[PDB]
Design an enzyme around this catalytic site. Structure first.
Site: not given
Length: 419
Positions: A105, A145
């Protein structure tokens, strides 16, 4: 003792999953710390002719299976304990569908609704120049995202192609690109088609004919809208109630999601939609449906709203919708519930299919992608389902057993752990 660390909660779920299996205590301390954290300083040049410096992270959890894969968040509430929490969460999602991927991430502490269009170009290109040392088509593969679009992922690709000097498969460095730069078909309806597949295979095991039952959806996001729609077109469900941040509606005769979405694009919210009743988000959770699918926010089910919920299937779609306090109180009810990282796994498997097409160079067709999406998502559910019925565990905890045992088996073969 008044604190909630978002990373330390993601470790305390792994210690709970170490008791339902036989794992070595020298490899259990390996999966509690990510292997390579970068924290770069990202300078952009503003429109006023001045320079600002935003802080950007990049966390790679565990590359024991292959390359690492994980999205990019742009939010002002970002922390290092929020990126390291999702990075140790991504490895149990890309293992359970048996992809050659590891977790990861990244994020930037910025507010993207206070930067214009040419200022987002000089931030998204300036993030790639700072972490080029630790990404690549075989090392680390970003994804979209919150507050990123596929428009932005085209810009990060171009600033990668200028640094690499085109000596490699540069289209495979990032997934979620537009259709005509090297993107895949059937990508915008991934998390819907991943979810509605797992609703079908669970209810076939629960043995309920869905052609005549109903469903309710909390939240009206883009993955929330298509969840209701692809339950109507493909599955056969009756969508009876929706909601958002303002309010919610309910109708006992089905609501067509095309006309409902035309209201939310028009007014501020779903308030005063015709042929319904303007209701609240709390009473929607204790409605009467065949399957409850929360997909909006996290921890909406707590200790004080636990045993009021009247449903048969709880489709955990959002990232951890149920707290562990109330999971056992609903477990004795006889409620089958597919977990969080087994319902939304469709957003990774279609994201994997864009990486295969860019590496080989030969793009598939639309239905051939959506036919192989069932083969991953139905097989990865039945590997969990037979485990749960034979060990007598909740399927939230039973999914963690096969998720670690695929990663621990690869750490034992690369020589990383002897015992």
């Amino acid at each position: 003792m008044v604190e909630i660390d978002p990373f330390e909660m993601a470790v305390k779920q792994l210690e709970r999953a170490a008791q339902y299996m036989d794992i070595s205590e020298e490899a259990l301390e390996w999966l509690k710390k990510p292997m390579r954290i970068v924290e770069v300083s990202v300078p952009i040049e503003m429109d006023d002719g001045s320079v600002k410096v935003f802080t950007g992270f990049r966390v790679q959890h565990n590359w024991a299976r292959g390359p690492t894969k994980g999205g990019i968040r742009w939010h002002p509430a970002e922390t290092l304990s929020t990126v390291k929490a999702l990075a140790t969460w991504m490895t149990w999602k890309v293992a359970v569908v048996d992809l050659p991927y590891g977790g990861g991430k990244g994020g930037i502490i910025v507010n993207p609704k206070e930067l214009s269009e040419r200022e987002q170009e000089r931030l998204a290109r300036a993030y790639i120049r700072a972490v080029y040392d630790v990404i690549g088509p075989w090392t680390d593969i970003p994804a979209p995202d919150v507050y990123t679009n596929p428009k932005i992922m085209g810009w990060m690709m171009d600033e990668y192609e200028t640094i690499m000097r085109r000596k490699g498969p540069a289209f495979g460095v990032i997934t979620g690109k537009p259709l005509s730069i090297g993107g895949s078909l059937g990508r915008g309806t991934a998390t819907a088609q991943g979810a509605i597949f797992t609703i079908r295979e669970a209810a076939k095991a629960l043995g309920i004919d869905l052609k005549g039952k109903k469903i309710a959806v909390q939240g009206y996001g883009n993955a929330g809208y298509y969840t209701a729609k692809l339950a109507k077109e493909q599955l056969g469900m009756t969508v009876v109630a929706v909601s958002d941040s303002r309010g919610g509606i309910y109708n006992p005769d089905g609501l067509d999601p095309d006309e409902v979405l035309k209201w939310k694009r028009e007014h501020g919210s779903v308030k005063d939609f015709p042929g319904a009743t303007n209701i609240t988000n709390e009473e929607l959770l204790e409605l009467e449906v065949d399957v409850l699918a929360p997909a909006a926010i996290e921890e909406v089910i707590t200790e004080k709203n636990a045993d009021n919920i009247k449903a048969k299937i709880v489709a955990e779609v959002a990232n951890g919708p149920v707290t562990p306090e109330a999971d056992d109180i609903l477990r004795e009810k006889g409620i089958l519930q597919i977990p969080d990282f087994l319902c939304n796994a469709g957003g990774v498997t279609v994201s994997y299919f864009e990486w295969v097409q860019n590496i080989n160079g030969y793009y598939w067709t639309e239905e051939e992608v959506r036919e192989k999406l069932d083969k991953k998502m139905t097989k990865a559910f039945w590997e969990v389902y037979n485990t749960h019925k034979d060990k007598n565990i909740h399927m939230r905890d039973a999914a963690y057993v096969v998720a670690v045992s695929r990663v621990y088996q690869a750490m034992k073969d690369r020589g990383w752990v002897k015992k």
